[PDB]
């Protein structure tokens, strides 16, 4: 062993948001989702600090992993939370963003990808918190990330994570020989949706670099 | 007569930008295009002030027409200018924006619509400055615009404009019986691309409402 699924479960549990009801927003969904993200970034670190062995990597690598992994880590997180919604995603700030807001705000198409390729599939197979924590750990232990020193160390940690996951999976779900594959095969979609989000975010960051000039602002009111 | 194509030609000529070469930009095309727009809005007014009869409408209507028409007025303008480029548009600030920048910046799809449905067709039929000024005048005289007082007055002005255009067209291009239609039939595309631009602009204006929070900014660098 040495990479126990129980502590991984602990790490997830320790970062669930303490969560009331979930009111809509329809008003500036993109903003709300970016605030939730900023907020969750703090808790993402704490989560990582609680994944076994993570903090015994060099400091330098711990930062590379998290700079390389966060967006996929946060997408996986809100996706798994959002399983109980129908066509919406549930943010950590306790807001619910409806598919219809997302199209109105211009991100309909990447949003739909999150619902179809992540949320719906997490829901159809009833992915549990242990499988989700493992998947996130695998992502956190990305031995391809640039500039790593302890390459081989991350490689060994990721190998650990998936061996325990396969183990957990074979034993908690022995009616499903394909389950382990099916879980790993969600990571390509995650990778992909992750990249598309970052494009979005880079574009909003350059927009915000420079206000609209004043007559143009006036024509828009 | 009373709506002479010559003065309409004058109005266009008086607002050509005084124009050197046209350097690229590839760097923040969206910004550049919005600055050009703001800049051209000042000159749009002067253009309007020079269209016959415009300034004898009530003040209130002159502002309604220009608030309702500007985006289509500016799109028509840069489209006609951009005929001599291949796959790019030429801004009034003397910048050239390449189709490849436009896709890189995320507005590839509306940009392509401008090239295909406006620029390329303006180019294939060699639309001249007189036809363009008339088309813009027709757009400027929009009797559907909300809240107009002198509805019937704008209606009569638009009727004038297209009668002189048809006239100019029959006489300057008598090899082309379809020319007049073909010109009017570009206005639906203009209308449409105009609406899609305004969506873009409203979205950038709300983005810019609110910076990215600081940890999120840090992950983006």
């Amino acid at each position: 062993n040495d990479m126990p699924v129980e502590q991984i479960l602990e790490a997830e549990l320790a970062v669930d948001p303490k969560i009331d009801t979930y009111i809509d927003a329809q008003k500036d969904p993109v903003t709300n989702i970016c605030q939730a993200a900023d907020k969750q970034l703090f808790t993402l670190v704490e989560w990582a600090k609680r994944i076994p062995h993570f903090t015994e990597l060099p400091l330098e690598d711990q930062v590379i992993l998290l700079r390389a992994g966060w967006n996929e880590l946060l997408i996986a997180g809100f996706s798994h939370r959002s399983i109980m919604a129908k066509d919406g995603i549930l943010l950590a700030t306790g807001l619910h963003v409806h598919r219809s807001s997302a199209h109105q705000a211009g991100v309909g198409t990447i949003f739909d990808r999150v619902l179809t390729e992540l949320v719906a599939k997490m829901r159809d197979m009833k992915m549990d918190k242990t499988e989700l924590g493992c998947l996130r750990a695998v992502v956190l232990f990305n031995p391809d990330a640039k500039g790593l020193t302890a390459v081989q160390e991350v490689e060994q940690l990721r190998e650990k994570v998936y061996a325990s996951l396969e183990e957990y999976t074979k034993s908690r779900y022995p009616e499903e020989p394909g389950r382990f594959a099916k879980l790993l095969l969600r990571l390509p979609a995650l990778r992909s949706i992750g990249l598309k989000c970052l494009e979005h975010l880079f574009f909003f960051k350059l927009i915000g670099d420079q206000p609209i000039d004043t007559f143009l602002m006036e024509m828009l009111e | 007569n009373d709506m002479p194509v010559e003065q309409i030609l004058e109005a266009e000529l008086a607002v050509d930008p005084k124009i050197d070469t046209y350097i690229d930009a590839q760097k923040d095309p969206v910004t550049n295009i919005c600055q050009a727009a703001d800049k051209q809005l000042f000159t749009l007014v002067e253009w309007a002030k020079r269209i016959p009869h415009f300034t004898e409408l009530p003040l209130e209507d002159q502002v309604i027409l220009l608030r309702a028409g500007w985006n289509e007025l500016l799109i028509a303008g840069f489209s006609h200018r951009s005929i001599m480029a291949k796959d790019g548009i030429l801004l009034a600030t003397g910048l050239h924006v390449h189709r490849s920048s436009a896709h890189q910046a995320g507005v590839g799809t509306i940009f392509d619509r401008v090239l295909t449905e406006l620029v390329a067709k303006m180019r294939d039929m060699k639309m001249d400055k007189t036809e363009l000024g008339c088309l813009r005048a027709v757009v400027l005289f929009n009797p559907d615009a909300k809240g107009l007082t002198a509805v019937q007055e704008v209606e009569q002005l638009r009727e004038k404009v297209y009668a002189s255009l048809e006239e100019y067209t029959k006489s300057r291009y008598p090899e082309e019986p379809g020319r007049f239609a073909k010109l009017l039939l570009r206005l639906p595309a203009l209308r449409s691309i105009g609406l899609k631009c305004l969506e873009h602009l409203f979205f950038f204006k709300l983005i810019g409402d609110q910076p990215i929070d600081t940890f999120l900014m840090e992950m983006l660098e």
Binding site: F42, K49, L59, V63, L66, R67 | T214, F215, E218
Partner: peptide, 12 residues
Amino acid sequence: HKILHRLLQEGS
């Protein structure tokens, strides 16, 4: 990267 470094030092 100030925020991430600082956070990575604190917990333990």
